[PDB]
Design a protein around this ligand. Sequence first.
Ligand SMILES: O[C@@H]1[C@@H](O)[C@@H](O)OC[C@H]1O
Ligand SMILES: O[C@@H]1[C@@H](O)[C@@H](O)OC[C@H]1O
Lengths: 680, 676, 457
Amino acid sequence: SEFILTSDKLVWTYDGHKLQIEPWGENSLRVRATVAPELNGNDWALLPAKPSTKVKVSEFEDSARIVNGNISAVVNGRGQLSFYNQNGKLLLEEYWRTRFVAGQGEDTSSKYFSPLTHEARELKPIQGGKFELRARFESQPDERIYGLGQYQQPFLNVKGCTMELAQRNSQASVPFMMSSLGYGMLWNNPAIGEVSFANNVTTWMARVTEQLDYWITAADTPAEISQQYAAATGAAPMLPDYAAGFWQCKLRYRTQDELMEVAREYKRRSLPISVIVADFFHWPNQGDWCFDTREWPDPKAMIDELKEMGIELMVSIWPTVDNRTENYKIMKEKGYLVKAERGVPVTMTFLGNTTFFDATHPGARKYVWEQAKKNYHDLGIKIFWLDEAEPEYSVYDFENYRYHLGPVLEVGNIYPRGYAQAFYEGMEEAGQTEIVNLLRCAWAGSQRYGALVWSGDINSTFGALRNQLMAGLNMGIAGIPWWTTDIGGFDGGDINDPAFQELLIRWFQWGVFCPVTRLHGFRQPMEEPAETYRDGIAQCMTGAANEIWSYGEDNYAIMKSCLELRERLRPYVMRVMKAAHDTGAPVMRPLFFDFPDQAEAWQIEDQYMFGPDILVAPVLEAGQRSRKVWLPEGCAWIDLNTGARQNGGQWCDCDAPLEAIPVFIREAAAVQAELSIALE
Amino acid sequence: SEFILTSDKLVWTYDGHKLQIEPWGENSLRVRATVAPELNGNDWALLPAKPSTKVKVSEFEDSARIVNGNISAVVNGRGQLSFYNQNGKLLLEEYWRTRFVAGQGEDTSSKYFSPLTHEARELKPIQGGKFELRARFESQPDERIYGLGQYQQPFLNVKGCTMELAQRNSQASVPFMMSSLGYGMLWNNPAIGEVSFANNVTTWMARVTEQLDYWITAADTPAEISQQYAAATGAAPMLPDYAAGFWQCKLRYRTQDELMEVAREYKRRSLPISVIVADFFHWPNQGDWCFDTREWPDPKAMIDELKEMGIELMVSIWPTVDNRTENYKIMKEKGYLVKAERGVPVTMTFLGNTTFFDATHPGARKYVWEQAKKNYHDLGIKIFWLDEAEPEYSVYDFENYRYHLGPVLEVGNIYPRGYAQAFYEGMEEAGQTEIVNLLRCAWAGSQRYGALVWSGDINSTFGALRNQLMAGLNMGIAGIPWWTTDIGGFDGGDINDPAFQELLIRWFQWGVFCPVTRLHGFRQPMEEPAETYRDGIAQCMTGAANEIWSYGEDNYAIMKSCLELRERLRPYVMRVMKAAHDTGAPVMRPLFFDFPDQAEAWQIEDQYMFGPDILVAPVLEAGQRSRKVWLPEGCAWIDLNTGARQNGGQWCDCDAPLEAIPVFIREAAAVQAELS
Amino acid sequence: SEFILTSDKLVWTYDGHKLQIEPWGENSLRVRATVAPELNGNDWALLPAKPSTKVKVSEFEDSARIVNGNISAVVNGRGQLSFYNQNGKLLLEEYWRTRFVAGQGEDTSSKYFSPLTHEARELKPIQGGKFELRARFESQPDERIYGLGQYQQPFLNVKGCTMELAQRNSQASVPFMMSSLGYGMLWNNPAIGEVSFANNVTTWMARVTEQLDYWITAADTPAEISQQYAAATGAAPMLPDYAAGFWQCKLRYRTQDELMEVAREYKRRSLPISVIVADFFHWPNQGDWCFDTREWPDPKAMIDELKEMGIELMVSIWPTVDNRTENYKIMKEKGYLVKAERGVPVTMTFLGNTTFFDATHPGARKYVWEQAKKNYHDLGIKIFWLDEAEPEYSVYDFENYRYHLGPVLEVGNIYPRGYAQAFYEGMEEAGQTEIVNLLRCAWAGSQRYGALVWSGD
Ligand SMILES: O[C@@H]1[C@@H](O)[C@@H](O)OC[C@H]1O
Ligand SMILES: O[C@@H]1[C@@H](O)[C@@H](O)OC[C@H]1O
């Protein structure tokens, strides 16, 4: 057992195991461990640390301590690590269950004493290869845990849940967690694996990795933890003003004329609309990244007319390259494609045999961007829909694929970040200052590349709606403030069905109070294409209509008033977006973000704060026409739908007719005067 | 998608996947699934089923259904399975998250619709080999889960916990679970893996296996579930009388004279003592399985004097075979040893380079038994301490070891069952009835081989005591009624330390109300052997004394009264042991076993029932001199220590002086008269 | 298909596969290939090359060519490589059997056209890991092949033989071959593997590696090839004069008295004797690296008398460290031991449970040297018997052991070179010139560390 200490770094070593703990921003430490000769140069999501104020390394009781403001790490003589805040409260301790550790007998008075033989930093060597990593920590009885990204499950607090650390359609692993004990932790490792916050033990796992790497931070409030995390992995940029308005989309406007008729119809009805969208397969083949001139005869004319109308066009980008295209040949020559480890060299079989571009290859990123620049951005398109961003392998056999940076098992989760990066850096280089792209997935730090994330191809049910609410709130805690969904969900909504229409309205009403308000879906009844193939290329179907007038008159009136409300909220939304850019605060956030000292704020999962001034209580059940709403203590609240003033610190039994979900405004906030509050 | 239905069997198939559901005892079904050409012949823990008269297989719309009494299974046209009780209530449903399944689009109105692509029955092919199995089930927000064996954790209800399906010192995987929703389930698969009862999904995993195999049972009460499980995997036999008395042990009586002096001191003071124990390294070398005559000059004379005193001798058995022994040579010739897949052919390095005998090899079982028969059983020893039963690899690299029945990844967890079987079958064939052996580990069905399990080499702390209460209760739920601990814990207790002495008293008081009352440990200050080596063989140390007079007179009086109390309890213990044999009920039970209709019985984890008539509320903290005790509704309760009558259905603040823990007797139960 | 050419380097690339060919000494080329982003910094046995002044790089038709004195490499537009001497004679040709390669159809008039689909440079990805390498070359009907090291087989010419690229007691993989066609080739890769010079195809194999790396040289005579190889991997030093005399040894002189009785009896009979040897287990325990004073009560007096007699003492060094020793404890603390990947942490069980010192770890080399220096070299011992140099695992499960430089599968064969290096560098640092140590095993370049190899048990 040997400490190698300096005035601002704590190293411990035994039998080739090196543990290194150091400052990494105010109130924060980075922890790395390896059994390789040295630590490698991989920083993954961590940006360079701003030098720390008042770091102190010391020795006591055969241990070493490193303090960095509000956090301290204690490594004992057996190499066992625990973290404390400035008040001496335990935040996080390693889980050890051994009788012999670091060449020493374990202390029999400790819960660490056990014949089971579990290590807290298990770097299990893979034969012929690298290491399978398990980092074990003790569970704590009181601990509530948030963040981790976007998971399809009805749990805000994920203590007791196990999350796959992998990217799949409708899932985003963004492995920053925030704990009710007053710390946050980033698992700074893009390897395929798992995090289980089991009641009996916390275990983070990487299938293949070179070393343990995580970042841990402490503060007295959630807001400070979020700010410290944004300083560590990057701030969201400022949202462009157009992105706070209404986004109209469906699967799919098949032609220029079809898309333009929808846009004109919105303007004819004097309805708000800021973005309209050309979904996938508007192109000749996958990997061409251009409009098919047969269905889209004059894209610049479309874009020019849309600009007169005050509407931005977004276009679908797919990361797939079909093996019959010119770009396949060139990208294959240059090694810009992902590779199958075994079997046929095809990563996806949707409407052709395609291979994903390698978003971890800087050359590939630049190649794909410059195709998009030439064929889209140069025409005035300022938003890209970066779909299939995981990427969506036809079969998720992560072991069978390899990237520029290594096997998908080792580096796979960073793919969506690189995909976002390709377009952000490219667009910034082309002179665009405010950049937002719609990403289906993300990793830690994706926020810095202007990633507006949406929750993918979920089904159209109340079950899904509930899952999306939890996922979006957890995404915000994981540092992704720009987040949205397909209003109505993606799959299964028949436009004539009363059950789906009710879901649509509830989801739309929630959508008004999401970071971005975006209507999209694959509506039934679907329509097969006229011809199944053209030039040997399989043709893409479309769903039914998905405009706000497509669901009858009564529903149109509700959705129209939702659009008008969203317009009135735009100034507030932009203030909250600025605060996200400035402070790392999420836009939609759990009640505990704004009211951390109130017990109920840590228990309630079916309410949230849309910025600091608006309390939202969505309706998550079919048929429900009332619900209970807790009003936080510390201010009075104005009921948006009735104008009644309610004191904080009580439960209200709120009416929830089909026409409105319960929403309350913080009394005397600037947003109160910006809204029209009717008296009923 | 194709159903193949008969009068008593449901089969579903698509793309080589075969799902087979059939009756397996009353109110029970066996579920199997494979992508191999056919199901194999491995039954593992399941005994032959008594034929069910009431089985009914039906087809309706696109689905098929099989009912066996109080359980039914429905399989839809997409091969997705859920279970219901006789009232039609959901017990358990598979977890599917796909857009396409069984050649069909998934229903978009169902929570099963998802692009994530998780199957409920994932048989993932291992390249060049067999399958990595994951069986996924939906979680339920109100589901509380018990059993699974013996885990070193402070949780009775294990909903939210993840348990490793592996055997290590102080852990036993016995993978039967009982749910508060009204079903029990056996994972009938000995593969290394894991069970995660996570809030978001339940996942059972097997690292290497040929097929999915589980057994599920339904009843309106826990008692019926326990009974149905015992019919599935085997009844505990009848406990022999002598096992209900006091078992005296320490690490370690180094000589015949040392052991005999302790027994003589117990008799000199007219104290109860039923079993005395010779711990490990009383032998010349590992794999000799005999007394070393230098320290044990006349074993027959020891056993005869102990018999005159009314005491049975138990002896340590280690499954290790040192490579310098004659038995290593012969066992190596016959192929009766465990094999390392890679590296030096050594499985443990404790006091020698040893290799474990293969408890899954029927020949090796017979060989080891016949050695123990010749050197011990023929002398009159009739209890064996089957230690290191996991077995305790120096390094738990399960992938690096192989048994007769296959790689340890595929079959490893059945080792302790085979180890118990070797001795139980051997002793039965030698004419012994009512067999009991002290096993350190178990698998499903170990109870049928007379396995008294103890919780291994835990530390001597109050934290450990708390874990042991939970583990023992969960072992009973998993069908292991004969269970015990080292009173005082194993490791770290200094006999002169007041703090340890307090723990010892609290643990002893609890041990009186355990299925077996057994004093053991490795007490400080330890003593190194005089000679480190003798004939090149590393010599084993000892701990300090561990007799009831070794901790002063005040503690002596307390433990003496504990032994006298245990003797008065013996007829009740034998009644509860017979009930365990007859009905599969545990001996130490969670409150919900006897009071399943009462909410508090499913919440309280620091009280339990010692049989149906005694409520026990252990003191689990240093310095504590009182505690809250919930008294179940439906009977009056008699305070064991005051004789006071208390009505059921209330919380009482109970006196808990150092000299007694709170214990209550069901009013008018036969044991009331027996105890005062 | 793309060539990236400079005046002294040929690079070809397609789909991330990079092939790099460059001069590496007179009449010699280095060949490397990888599918990683770039070539790594591992040179293994190759010393830095003296600059070649007349190197000529050209492109013609769809091909490219690099000439360096007596050798030239030609790479066609499909990335297929062949070597020629100054007379235009074919030396070595890659083995390809495909219908489609480097994005192009294969030529149907060539023996390379085949549905079999074998590549000459097969970097087969290991799932979650690195690469399994096979480098295939055409066999040639009258090629005779020599070198490769020390194999227990009655064949000087090894055309038609298959040699394991692994170290075992009585075997040494030193993977430099000399062909009768007039070239030499070093497989500059320490991975566990195989070289088969089969009549139908030549295949070099590496179980685990990051990249292909070999060195190839051409000349009109063997003597020139041997000279060019010594310039590439290092010259043997000058042998000390005592090493040409008679070395007397047995298993084993157990005591100081027994050894000295033999030495004196050689002198009493007026017989020549230059070296006498103390074999293994003259020490208290494995990893102590000192005389046991019970059997060897005054080592200084022994060495001084042998010096008067004109005799050098050599002593047995074992690389094993028994787990009861003080050096085990310290070497474990510092990470200076070889590690088992699975199972008991024991690499050899001969007369105790021992773990090998990691001869690929620079710190461990220095640690073991300094023990031998304190206990042997400071007393006047000038020769070390570096036994068990493979090292001799009780079980040769190469997949189950890992070194400082990586898994034994990737780097294992360089261990005996590091073991030699530890003592050579240490003795040189202590002021000794003309160093010779008795090594049981070797890799390419072991000669530069004064390695007198013997053929084992
Ligand atoms: O949102 C959808 C996206 O997730 C993908 O499946 O491509 C079509 C889009 O409509
Ligand atoms: O209980 C102990 C057992 O678990 C093992 O370690 O052998 C010695 C016994 O005292």
